[PDB]
Amino acid sequence: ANARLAKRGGRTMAITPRHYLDFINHYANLFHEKRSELEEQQMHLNVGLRKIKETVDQVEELRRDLRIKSQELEVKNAAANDKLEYAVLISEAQAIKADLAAVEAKVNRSTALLKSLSAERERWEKTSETFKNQMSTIAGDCLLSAAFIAYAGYFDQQMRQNLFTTWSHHLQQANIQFRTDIARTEYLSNADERLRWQASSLPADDLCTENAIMLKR
Amino acid sequence: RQLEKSLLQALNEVKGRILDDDTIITTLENLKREAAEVTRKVEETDIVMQEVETVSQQYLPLSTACSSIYFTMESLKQIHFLYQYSLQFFLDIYHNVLYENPNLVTDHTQRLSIITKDLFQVAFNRVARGMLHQDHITFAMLLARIKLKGTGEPTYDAEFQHFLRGNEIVLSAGSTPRIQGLTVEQAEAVVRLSCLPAFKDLIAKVQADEQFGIWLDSSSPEQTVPYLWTPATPIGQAIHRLLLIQAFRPDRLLAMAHMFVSTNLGESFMSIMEQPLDLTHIVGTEVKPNTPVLMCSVPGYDASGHVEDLAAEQNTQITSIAIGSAEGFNQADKAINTAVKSGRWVMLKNVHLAPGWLMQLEKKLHSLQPHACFRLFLTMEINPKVPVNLLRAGRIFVFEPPPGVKANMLRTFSSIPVSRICKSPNERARLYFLLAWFHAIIQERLRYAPLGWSKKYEFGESDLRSACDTVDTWLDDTAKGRQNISPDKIPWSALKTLMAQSIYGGRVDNEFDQRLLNTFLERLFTTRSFDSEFKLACKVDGHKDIQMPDGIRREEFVQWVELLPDTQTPSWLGLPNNAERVLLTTQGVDMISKMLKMQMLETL
């Protein structure tokens, strides 16, 4: 690529094995960082799913207890009607009714919690299922990220895109899977640090975005 | 993001049953409020969408033209390696456009077109002010291409590609059309042009239009072009005519390019470059005080006098220092510091000899903020030793011999002050006009070497100033305050001999060139003693000639200068009209090669 650019007419600049050493160091660092981030994210997801399963089990237990003591209240009311000692039975039925009201209120709050958290669960399950596939593409995607972050810092946008497309064609021909449907800036820069860069007088273009990524990494 | 992070870290640290804690109810309320703010997100997104679609449908073609203009200016440096414009220069162009509106409309639909036209015009002006005249047609063609691409208008991509890559593509071998009125190279050009479906039956059409043997080939094909490209837009008709004249008569390709640019952008689009350079307004307004004013100059034509006259007119002080020795660098730095402190102008002459010092100068200039009314002028020759940093920092002005007899007269009359030309007697103005005509002819003849002159003499402004001085002093000698002189009493022989032996004949080597100069002086400085109907030249051998204006005043002579037709032939100069043909064809081929360099960037 450097020879092609030199023959095209732009100034060539020398490539050294220091570039390769830096690129392989970047590959190791990015692979380790992405693996650690995925592992801690999965741990958080597993804890959240276990807790919401426990909440669903508690909801079912509350429902069973509520219906059982509702039937108990009905039986006690029938017994008090037959006995129509009446004041004690009336006070007992009132206490059972207050317990039913409290448990029904807690069931209502638990139902609201389940309805609010169902939308979260419906995407947490998808992310958990997608994690198994996205674990495999880490090697190729971090390879591309390291090559971009250690090599293409001098060329312009078109030549950087040519390099990225060539590497992607090679990895496709080598039967190694890489995460195609993601931006190379989005994979490397977090949203909060992108916001901090945009606050720190950085232009909002992709070129300056990966330039800031190179300056950070 | 705070929503998601806080919710996950709250659910992960419950350490118990969620249904048995009120903190989980607080997180529920948090989720409800944040769902409410996610709900009101939608109207803000809708207003953002309507705003961005409004601004897109208003000013997207303007931004596309912005990008195309700046990238053409960036890729411009591949031609002459001298000009390197910068994004700061382009943004200064935008501050000039969007904030200086002539006749300032209030209707946005007309204001957008006004902004676009003013952008194209001021971009061409500010860029071609620092380019040789060989490349102005190339830049105008690029501007016209950008206008055509940004125009609803059918894009002429295939025929423009054929026009740019006509000679490069291989034509038919062994195929020779009729030689009835065209040569072998013309036949090859027709064969190459025959690939276009529109230009299909050209072999039939050239013999169909047998009576049009003058409009197609020979004569002057600028105004007249036979045949056409279904209805066709005028721009497409211009493109077809340009292709036809490239096939038939490659000499007038420059004229066809000029009229194509005129039809595509305006008949006065590039006509402001023929005017003399108005340095005063550009220096006082269009130049930031930090930015130095580079005055590049071709050899034999300096530019110190222009800025010295400017400083004299504007009563400012210039500490002109010649560059080329160490103490020279010392007073240059001292005067620059004193100028930044005070505000007076500073000149450094011939800076093209110390690039190592120019690097320090450019870095020092970027390291300081100057006074408001302080401009730094640097003058240099065109050589590769000039640092690209300095070229990027400074505004670039080129100084070249003016293209055209009319342009030369305009520059001469702008240079000569009105108080000097309008002095008594009344024949001084006519004598100055004759002097300017003679200077224009002898300087226009330098272009067509070695026919006009055997050698490239340095017939510059020094000779003109000395001739004006000697005319003034001999007229003061022969006129004792009289308001008018009879033409017989004018020292014609004295003026002829003095300008033939001291001023203009001083640089003349060959006896044949000296005889030629004597011929011009004898023909021109007699006028049959200021007789009317004095034939200056013969523009066309068939019923055309240039005659002396009957005016007797500077305003009349200037008016006669601007009434000259924009067309010019070497028959004005006295050369045969075939003198400029090979040079014009070579310039056309150079234009084609320059645009080929432009488009490609868009054993032994």
DSSP conformation letters of B479-511: -SS-S---TTTS-HHHHHHHIIIIISSTT--SH
Burial B271-306 (b: 16+ CB within 10 A, else e): eebeeebebeebbeebbeebbbbbbbbeeebbbbeb
CA A153 to chain centre: 30
Beta bridge mates, B377: B293, B347
Place of tokens 């071609």: B128
Structural contact between residues B175 and B188, judged by C-beta atoms closer than 8 angstroms: no
Cβ neighbours of B8 in A, within 8 Å? 44, 48
Query: What crossing angle do the helices spanning B405-415 and B554-562 adopt, rounded to 10°?
Result: 150
Which H or E run contains B361? helix B355-366
Residues 6 or more apart whose Cβ sits within 8 Å of residue B93 = B119, B122, B123, B126
Cβ neighbours of A62 in B, within 8 Å? 19
Q: Look up residue B179 and give its two tokens.
A: 């030689």
Find, among B114, B119, B116, the residue nearest to B92 by Cα.
B119
CA B144 to chain centre: 14
Please state, in angstroms and rounded to a whole number, the distance separating the CA atoms of residues B456 and B447. 9
Q: B415, exposed or middle or buried, with CB in 10 Å at 0-12, 13-18, 19+? A: middle
Residues 6 or more apart whose Cβ sits within 8 Å of residue B473 = none
Structural contact between residues B209 and B231, judged by C-beta atoms closer than 8 angstroms: no
For residues B164, B168, B170, B172, the Cα torsion angle rounded to the nearest 10 degrees is 60
B8 touches chain A (CB under 8 A): yes
Residue type, B376: L
Beta carbons of A52 and B28 less than 8 Å apart: no
Would you give the end-to-end CA distance of chain B in angstroms? Answer: 65
Please state, in angstroms and rounded to a whole number, the distance separating the CA atoms of residues B348 and B354. 11
Place of tokens 């005319």: B471
Q: Look up residue B258 and give its two tokens.
A: 């000029």
Please state, in angstroms and rounded to a whole number, the distance separating the CA atoms of residues A37 and A25. 18
Resolution for this model in angstroms, one decimal place?
3.4
Compare CB distances from B14 to A44, A51, A191 and report the shortest one's residue: A51
Structural contact between residues B372 and B289, judged by C-beta atoms closer than 8 angstroms: yes
Ramachandran region, residue B26 (left: φ > 0; alpha: ψ -120 to 50; beta: rest) = alpha
Q: Look up residue A134 and give its two tokens.
A: 């996205």
Compare CB distances from B24 to A44, A59, A113 and report the shortest one's residue: A113
Beta carbons of B28 and A109 less than 8 Å apart: yes
Residue ranges of the alpha helices (H) in A84-201?
Answer: 86-136, 138-151, 157-173, 184-188, 191-199
Beta carbons of A48 and B12 less than 8 Å apart: yes
Interface test with chain A among B18, B25, B32, B600, by most A beta carbons within 10 Å? B18
φ, ψ of residue B306 to 5 degrees: the values are -60, -50
Structural contact between residues B342 and B316, judged by C-beta atoms closer than 8 angstroms: no
Strand ranges, E, within B370-446: 376-381, 395-399
The sign of the dihedral angle between the CA atoms of A25, A28, A34, A39 is negative
Cβ neighbours of B12 in A, within 8 Å? 44, 47-48, 51
Burial A130-160 (b: 16+ CB within 10 A, else e): eeeeeeeebbbbbbbbbbbbbbbeebeeebb
Provide the experimental method for this PDB entry: cryo-EM
Structural contact between residues B393 and B362, judged by C-beta atoms closer than 8 angstroms: yes
Q: Report the 10 Å Cβ neighbour count for B588.
A: 21
Q: B253, exposed or middle or buried, with CB in 10 Å at 0-12, 13-18, 19+? A: buried
Beta carbons of B17 and A112 less than 8 Å apart: no
Find, among B69, B94, B73, the residue nearest to B286 by Cα.
B94
Instruction: Tell me which DSSP letter residue B276 carries.
Output: P
Beta carbons of A109 and B17 less than 8 Å apart: no
Strand ranges, E, within B233-337: 293-297, 318-322
Interface test with chain B among A55, A56, A103, A111, by most B beta carbons within 10 Å? A55
CA B198 to chain centre: 34
Please state, in angstroms and rounded to a whole number, the distance separating the CA atoms of residues B504 and B500. 6
B405 vs A50, B367, B466, B566, B567, CA distance in Å?
93, 45, 20, 10, 10
Which H or E run contains B345? strand B345-349
Please state, in angstroms and rounded to a whole number, the distance separating the CA atoms of residues B307 and B295. 10
Instruction: Tell me which DSSP letter residue B243 carries.
Output: H
Q: Look up residue B227 and give its two tokens.
A: 């045949």
Please state, in angstroms and rounded to a whole number, the distance separating the CA atoms of residues B303 and B399. 7
